[PDB]
RNA sequence: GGUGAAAUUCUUGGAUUUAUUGAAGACUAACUACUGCGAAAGCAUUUGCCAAGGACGUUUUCAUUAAUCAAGAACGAAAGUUAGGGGAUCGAAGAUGAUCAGAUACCGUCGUAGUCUUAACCAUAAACUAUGCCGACUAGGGAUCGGGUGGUGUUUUUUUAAUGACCCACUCGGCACCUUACGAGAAAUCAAAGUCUUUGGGUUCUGGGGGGAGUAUGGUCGCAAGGCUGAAACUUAAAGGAAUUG
RNA sequence: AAUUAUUGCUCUUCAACGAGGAAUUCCUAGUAAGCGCAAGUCAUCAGCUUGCGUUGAUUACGUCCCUGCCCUUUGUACACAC
RNA sequence: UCCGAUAUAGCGUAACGGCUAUCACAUCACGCUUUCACCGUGGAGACCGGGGUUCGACUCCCCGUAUCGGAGCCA
């Protein structure tokens, strides 16, 4: 529900897509 | 709560009041009633020297008790034991204080509180911190309800009060200054100077505290107790 | 044994959490013109005389 | 004509302290708390427990030589509630009956000039 | 929708109020939004003045009182049989009872 | 000691408590307000120094030098980051005692980072009055803050004066408040959210049903955390606002 | 038709119960309480019920303290309505 | 080998030689809540073992049992 934790959840996934992508470039 | 202690000794009877002796506190000469109270201490044993443990006690007593009359009812006075001999141990001035309920009565809203302190020393090498408190008052025939001060009267009032306290201490060593607070004469002087700035009711000055002392001067103390 | 006979002039009303205490403005029989309020347990009418072991306990008033 | 002590009644919540000392305050007489007279671990601050504790202080005063007392009522103070506990009044109430003479009742609750911080967090104590 | 014109508080022209702590739960609350109530009772109590005065040296000297100012948060104030709730019309009333 | 009740915990090695001191760091109570200052964030102990600011008074001076603003720039709560100092309280994390069917939550006791400071980043907030700035006009009323004007007014100096504080009247500027609706609005409400179909005073920014989505990608800034800019595919007939009765 | 005695009568047998703990029911005047009678169900069987009469107190003449319910205010993202 | 310490309901725990021994938890029942939790009311459960002292031992002395700590070793 809470938009505070969907912002937090997305930010933690921003880290993952940014860290898994560094393995290529 | 009674049967709750689990362990009383980390490792694993004689009544003490029969071993104690009673004295009587003597107030300085600048007080109406020399009789103050009564204390306790063990006998002067071969190692403890119970006269020594009784040397530095500090007792606080109301000024109404010392002066008899109940006008000076709040006015807490602290007396410090300086010399003991012949079971009439002698005490000297140690500081004056206000009762909490008196201080809280004066502080009411819709009026300005003014405070002022100085660190002026006396002629007998005593060092004190005089505190002064005052409250703005609503002049007669006033309509508005608060009557605050304009934050420049306060600076002028605080400058006037600080100047008065320093001058009124230099020259008064211990005795006349103690006999200056008892008859409430300093505050009457404060009102006279500040009556041209702002009304300022309730100029009961404040508590006073000692900071440091010179050499004992045993003869000076004996000059008070006759 | 100080015993005071006091005669009531007014029944203020019931009081207490469970409504078992009555408030009464009661005058003293002797030394008239000095009165007191006293909690009363049982039923009382106007101009009834009471017995006291304390004369000047002022019961609290709900006002 | 009177031997005067200082009551120094400290009645916080969860307990109540009453212990009379000498005028100088360095020699104490018969310190008994509210948790010494009842075994509940919950009625330590109760008015009944303080009533029993006050009588013991007053009783032991007679055999020592204290016939009058100066009352100094105290709350926890500091950053805590600063209000007297439930047993503060009963302790003062009870010792008057034993025969001690009262004088110069005064509140000695320590009050700060906006001191450090109060425990509980920003959102208080959630209940 | 807006429920109050002041909306909780007395902040018009400050922007910040330097909050104080509640007395029951110790919750942060701005000073203006606080619900300050003053409690000034006698030290002993209203009905106990005999037993202290009956056994009192310095007869009827002052019988002094205790002064302290209490701050509650809105949650603690409502729960404590205080300003609890008023109807929509009576919410506008500001005068004390 | 703590709690609704407890327990973890400290205690005959003297805990809690009382008294006399000493140290450290933080904070600035009560006074404290429908009160003040600041562009906002914000700012509450005394004093000294430095520079700054509004309003008022003005028969002083200049003379249209102005309003709003892409780009660009200064400041920017808390949290967070880098490096020293400090590190008392409280205390994300963590450890424990409970409660619970479970409780890595609420509650209790500890407790690092942090909380304070110096130098440097960050550039965010329900950063809200959810109400851009400037200008003019439209109903009354009292209160208050600052400045000014007048009154043989009151009080105190040396009865007396100039003063200081008050009282009355007026005026400028300000934080606000009360009543009403010619007026507005969907209403709640609003002296502006009024002078808008009888539609045009000047100007900047932003929105175009709801999700996907402030997401993906590309730039740019940042030590990092992240900030700014910012879709499409796809999916849907409702989401949403204010009030009424239950 | 009575055997797990339908009930009535006689004799003998003569058990807990020494006034009842935490709780909880009913009750304001002929009311409570004591006592019995008629009817109901019945071929037989009242320790039940519906009514009736005899004797017949104390304590209130109030309160919202506990419990239950009603009204108002209040919040709502419920309307098949917690 | 010596010295010292420990040994009570299903768990923990304290003992005055004038009592086959209190408690909180676990349960037996009855309670109070729409219901589930908290809370209340009366029991059953116990002294490591064996001897001696004693008008009267859980409790005072001796031995053994199991555990723990510290000390020393010419068959």
UniProtKB/Swiss-Prot annotation, chain B:
N-terminally acetylated by acetyltransferase NatA. One of its GO terms (biological process) is maturation of SSU-rRNA from tricistronic rRNA transcript (SSU-rRNA, 5.8S rRNA, LSU-rRNA). Residues 1-13 are annotated as: Disordered. InterPro entries: Ribosomal_eS1, Ribosomal_eS1_CS, Ribosomal_eS1_euk. Residues 1-12 have a biased composition (Basic residues). GO terms for molecular function: structural constituent of ribosome. Disulfide bonds: none annotated. Keywords: Acetylation, Cytoplasm, Isopeptide bond, Phosphoprotein, Ribonucleoprotein, Ribosomal protein, Ubl conjugation. The modification N-acetylalanine is found at residue 1. Its main location: cytoplasm. Belongs to the eukaryotic ribosomal protein eS1 family. Component of the ribosome, a large ribonucleoprotein complex responsible for the synthesis of proteins in the cell. The small ribosomal subunit (SSU) binds messenger RNAs (mRNAs) and translates the encoded message by selecting cognate aminoacyl-transfer RNA (tRNA) molecules. The large subunit (LSU) contains the ribosomal catalytic site termed the peptidyl transferase center (PTC), which catalyzes the formation of peptide bonds, thereby polymerizing the amino acids delivered by tRNAs into a polypeptide chain. PANTHER family: 40S RIBOSOMAL PROTEIN S3A. Component of the small ribosomal subunit (SSU). Mature yeast ribosomes consist of a small (40S) and a large (60S) subunit. The 40S small subunit contains 1 molecule of ribosomal RNA (18S rRNA) and 33 different proteins (encoded by 57 genes). The large 60S subunit contains 3 rRNA molecules (25S, 5.8S and 5S rRNA) and 46 different proteins (encoded by 81 genes). eS1 interacts directly with uS11 and eS26, which form part of the mRNA exit tunnel. Present with 92400 molecules/cell in log phase SD medium. This is Small ribosomal subunit protein eS1A. It comes from Saccharomyces cerevisiae (strain ATCC 204508 / S288c). The gene is RPS1A.
From Swiss-Prot, chain D:
Residues 107-127 are annotated as: Disordered. It comes from the Eukaryota. PROSITE patterns: RIBOSOMAL_S11. InterPro entries: Ribosomal_uS11 (IPR001971), Ribosomal_uS11_CS (IPR018102), Ribosomal_uS11_sf (IPR036967). One of its GO terms (biological process) is cytoplasmic translation. Gene3D superfamilies: Ribosomal protein S11 (3.30.420.80). GO terms for cellular component: cytosol; cytosolic small ribosomal subunit; nucleolus; small-subunit processome. Present with 3370 molecules/cell in log phase SD medium. There are 2 genes for uS11 in yeast. Belongs to the universal ribosomal protein uS11 family. Component of the small ribosomal subunit (SSU). Mature yeast ribosomes consist of a small (40S) and a large (60S) subunit. The 40S small subunit contains 1 molecule of ribosomal RNA (18S rRNA) and 33 different proteins (encoded by 57 genes). The large 60S subunit contains 3 rRNA molecules (25S, 5.8S and 5S rRNA) and 46 different proteins (encoded by 81 genes). uS11 interacts with eS1 forming part of the mRNA exit tunnel. uS11 interacts with snoRNA U3. uS11 interacts with MPP10. Component of the ribosomal small subunit (SSU) processome composed of at least 40 protein subunits and snoRNA U3. This is Small ribosomal subunit protein uS11B. The lineage of its organism: Eukaryota, Fungi, Dikarya, Ascomycota, Saccharomycotina. The gene is RPS14B.
């Amino acid at each position: 529900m809470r938009a505070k934790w969907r912002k937090k959840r997305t930010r933690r996934l921003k880290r993952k897509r940014r860290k898994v992508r560094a393995r290529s470039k | 709560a009674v049967g709750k202690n689990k362990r009383l000794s980390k490792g694993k009877v004689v009544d003490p009041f029969t071993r104690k002796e009673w004295f009587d506190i003597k107030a300085p000469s600048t007080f109406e009633n020399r009789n103050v109270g009564k204390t306790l201490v063990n006998k002067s044993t071969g190692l403890k020297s119970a006269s020594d443990a009784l040397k530095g006690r500090v007792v606080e007593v109301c000024l109404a008790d010392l002066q008899g009359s109940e006008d000076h009812s709040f006015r807490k006075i602290k007396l410090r034991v300086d010399e003991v001999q012949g079971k009439n141990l002698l005490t000297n001035f140690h500081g004056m204080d206000f009762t909490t309920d008196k201080l809280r009565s004066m502080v009411r809203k819709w009026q300005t509180l003014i405070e002022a302190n100085v660190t002026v020393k006396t002629s007998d090498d005593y060092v004190l911190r005089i505190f002064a408190i005052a409250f703005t008052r609503k002049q007669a025939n006033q309509v508005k309800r608060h009557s605050y001060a304009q934050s420049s009267h306060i600076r002028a009032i605080r400058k006037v009060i600080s100047e008065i306290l320093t001058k009124e201490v230099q020259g008064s060593t211990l005795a006349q200054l103690t006999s200056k607070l008892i008859p409430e004469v300093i505050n009457k002087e404060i009102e006279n100077a500040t009556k041209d700035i702002f009304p300022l009711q309730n100029i009961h000055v404040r508590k006073v505290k000692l900071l440091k002392q010179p050499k004992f001067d045993v003869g000076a103390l004996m000059a008070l107790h006759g | 044994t100080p015993v005071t006979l006091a005669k009531v002039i007014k029944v203020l009303g019931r009081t207490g959490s469970r409504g078992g205490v009555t408030q009464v403005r009661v005058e003293f029989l002797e030394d008239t013109s000095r009165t007191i309020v006293r909690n009363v347990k049982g039923p009382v009418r106007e101009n009834d005389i009471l017995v006291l072991m304390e004369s000047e306990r002022e019961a609290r008033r709900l006002r | 004509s009177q031997v005067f002590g200082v009551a120094r009644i400290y009645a916080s919540f969860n307990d109540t302290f009453v212990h009379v000392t000498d005028l100088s305050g360095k020699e104490t007489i018969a310190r008994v708390t509210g948790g010494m007279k009842v075994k509940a671990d919950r009625d330590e601050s109760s008015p009944y427990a303080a009533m029993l504790a006050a009588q013991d202080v007053a009783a032991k005063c007679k055999e020592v030589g204290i016939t009058a007392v100066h009352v100094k009522i105290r709350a926890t103070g500091g950053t805590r509630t600063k209000t007297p506990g439930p047993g503060g009044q009963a302790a003062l109430r009870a010792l008057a009956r034993s025969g001690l003479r009262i004088g110069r009742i005064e509140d000695v609750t320590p009050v700060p000039s906006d001191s450090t911080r109060k425990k509980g967090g920003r959102r208080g104590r959630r209940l | 929708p807006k429920k109050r014109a002041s909306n909780g508080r007395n902040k018009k022209g400050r922007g910040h109020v330097k909050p104080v702590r509640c007395v029951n739960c110790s919750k942060s609350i701005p000073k203006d939004k606080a619900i300050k109530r003053m409690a000034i009772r006698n030290i002993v109590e209203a009905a106990a003045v005999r037993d202290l005065s009956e056994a009192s040296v310095y007869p009827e000297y002052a019988l002094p009182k205790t002064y302290n100012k209490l701050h509650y948060c809105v949650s603690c104030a409502i729960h404590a049989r205080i300003v609890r709730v008023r109807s929509r019309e009576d919410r506008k009333n500001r005068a004390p009872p």
